[PDB]
Every structure is written in C-alpha cells, then in structure tokens.
Scaffold this active site. Sequence first.
Site, PDB file in Angstrom:
ATOM      1  N   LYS A   1      -5.133   4.695  13.028  1.00 38.61           N
ATOM      2  CA  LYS A   1      -4.502   4.491  11.709  1.00 38.61           C
ATOM      3  C   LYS A   1      -4.457   2.988  11.394  1.00 38.61           C
ATOM      4  O   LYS A   1      -3.625   2.277  11.949  1.00 38.61           O
ATOM      5  CB  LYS A   1      -3.084   5.125  11.632  1.00 38.61           C
ATOM      6  CG  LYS A   1      -2.562   5.161  10.192  1.00 38.61           C
ATOM      7  CD  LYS A   1      -1.252   5.915   9.997  1.00 38.61           C
ATOM      8  CE  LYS A   1      -0.008   5.200  10.464  1.00 38.61           C
ATOM      9  NZ  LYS A   1       1.216   5.947  10.067  1.00 38.61           N
TER      10      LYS A   1
ATOM     11  N   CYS B   1      -8.548  -4.998  -0.876  1.00 40.45           N
ATOM     12  CA  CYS B   1      -9.557  -3.950  -0.918  1.00 40.45           C
ATOM     13  C   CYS B   1      -8.911  -2.544  -0.709  1.00 40.45           C
ATOM     14  O   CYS B   1      -8.146  -2.328   0.250  1.00 40.45           O
ATOM     15  CB  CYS B   1     -10.622  -4.223   0.143  1.00 40.45           C
ATOM     16  SG  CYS B   1     -11.856  -2.912   0.292  1.00 40.45           S
TER      17      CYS B   1
ATOM     18  N   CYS C   1     -11.241   0.191  -1.158  1.00 40.70           N
ATOM     19  CA  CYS C   1     -12.447   1.021  -1.052  1.00 40.70           C
ATOM     20  C   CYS C   1     -12.998   1.032   0.403  1.00 40.70           C
ATOM     21  O   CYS C   1     -13.893   1.818   0.694  1.00 40.70           O
ATOM     22  CB  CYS C   1     -13.523   0.567  -2.036  1.00 40.70           C
ATOM     23  SG  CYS C   1     -14.296  -1.017  -1.620  1.00 40.70           S
TER      24      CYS C   1
ATOM     25  N   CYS D   1     -10.403  -7.896  -0.852  1.00 41.51           N
ATOM     26  CA  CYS D   1     -11.471  -7.473  -1.750  1.00 41.51           C
ATOM     27  C   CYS D   1     -12.541  -8.590  -1.853  1.00 41.51           C
ATOM     28  O   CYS D   1     -12.192  -9.762  -2.039  1.00 41.51           O
ATOM     29  CB  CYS D   1     -10.885  -7.133  -3.117  1.00 41.51           C
ATOM     30  SG  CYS D   1     -12.123  -6.819  -4.397  1.00 41.51           S
TER      31      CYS D   1
ATOM     32  N   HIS E   1     -16.553  -2.971  -4.093  1.00 45.15           N
ATOM     33  CA  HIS E   1     -16.174  -1.762  -4.834  1.00 45.15           C
ATOM     34  C   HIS E   1     -17.160  -1.504  -5.990  1.00 45.15           C
ATOM     35  O   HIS E   1     -17.433  -0.348  -6.307  1.00 45.15           O
ATOM     36  CB  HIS E   1     -14.730  -1.860  -5.365  1.00 45.15           C
ATOM     37  CG  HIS E   1     -14.482  -3.039  -6.257  1.00 45.15           C
ATOM     38  ND1 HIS E   1     -14.019  -4.244  -5.751  1.00 45.15           N
ATOM     39  CD2 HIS E   1     -14.653  -3.167  -7.596  1.00 45.15           C
ATOM     40  CE1 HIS E   1     -13.930  -5.059  -6.789  1.00 45.15           C
ATOM     41  NE2 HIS E   1     -14.308  -4.457  -7.917  1.00 45.15           N
TER      42      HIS E   1
HETATM   43  S1  FES Z   1     -11.680  -2.849  -3.635  1.00 44.02           S
HETATM   44 FE1  FES Z   1     -12.933  -2.823  -1.772  1.00 44.02          FE
HETATM   45  S2  FES Z   1     -14.108  -4.609  -2.112  1.00 44.02           S
HETATM   46 FE2  FES Z   1     -12.856  -4.704  -3.981  1.00 44.02          FE
END
Ligand code: FES
Lengths: 65, 65
Positions: free
Chosen positions: A13, A30, A32, A41, A45
């Site tokens: 986790k 981030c 994603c 980030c 994404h």
């Molecule tokens: S939300 Fe994953 S790289 Fe921007």
Amino acid sequence: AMINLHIQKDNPKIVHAFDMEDLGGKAVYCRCWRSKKFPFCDGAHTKHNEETGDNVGPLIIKKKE
Amino acid sequence: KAMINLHIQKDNPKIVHAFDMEDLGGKAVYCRCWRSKKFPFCDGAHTKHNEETGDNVGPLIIKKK
Ligand code: FES
Ligand code: FES
C-alpha cells in the site's frame, strides 16, 4: 485491472505523508501513477489520457499568496 | 488501454483539484485511486480496489507539523 503498474510493487500500500512546510509555495501531485517524479506530477497524465481516453489530472496544493 | 478513473465527473476532460493550504486544516487525506465516494478525499475505497485488482495504491496525506 490495476491503476499502478510499475511503482514500488514490493510495497502492499503506497502512502505518502507530508508536512505542509515540505510543499513550499506549491506542490503538484500525480494521481495517475505514470509520473517519473511520483508522488509529483510531471505531465505524464496527458499521454495516459490520450492513449486510454481517460480524464485524470493532478492535485495542486499551494500557499494563499 | 484501460482507464484509471471509471465514474468520477466523466463530462470533465481533465479532473484537476487545486487547494490553498488553509483549506486543508490540520490534515487532509487525498484519494489517488479514483474510487472514493468523497473524491478528491480518500474514503478508504482503495482497500477494496487493492483486494479486487491486486494493486498497491494508497492515499496522499498532507498535515500540519
Ligand atoms: S497526474 Fe500523474 S503525471 Fe500529472
Ligand atoms: S479512496 Fe482512493 S486512495 Fe483512499
């Protein structure tokens, strides 16, 4: 189907905890799990959304001024 | 191939959340699995996602020092 495919797969986790002082003026996180700078980030994404048709984006935490 | 976000605000082409550090209070726990019913906040839905998909995703915690 999994969301995270490559990050710290030995960890059951993945949780990141920060003090607000560690963010400085602005932190872009981030959501994603495709960023090379995870938990931050890096714009990965955009490539994910283009290839899968998804609509995910980052989380921005900033100072009021 | 397959998307990360399946049901949250699919009318929005790129879901981005921006907060001021004052909007967090003492602690904010943010969802990074896109399964929370309280999105952008974590409601523990990641546990069910990890159990069903074999994933290891968890939230982002921002707190006061
Ligand atoms: S939300 Fe994953 S790289 Fe921007
Ligand atoms: S509900 Fe998504 S990380 Fe907890």
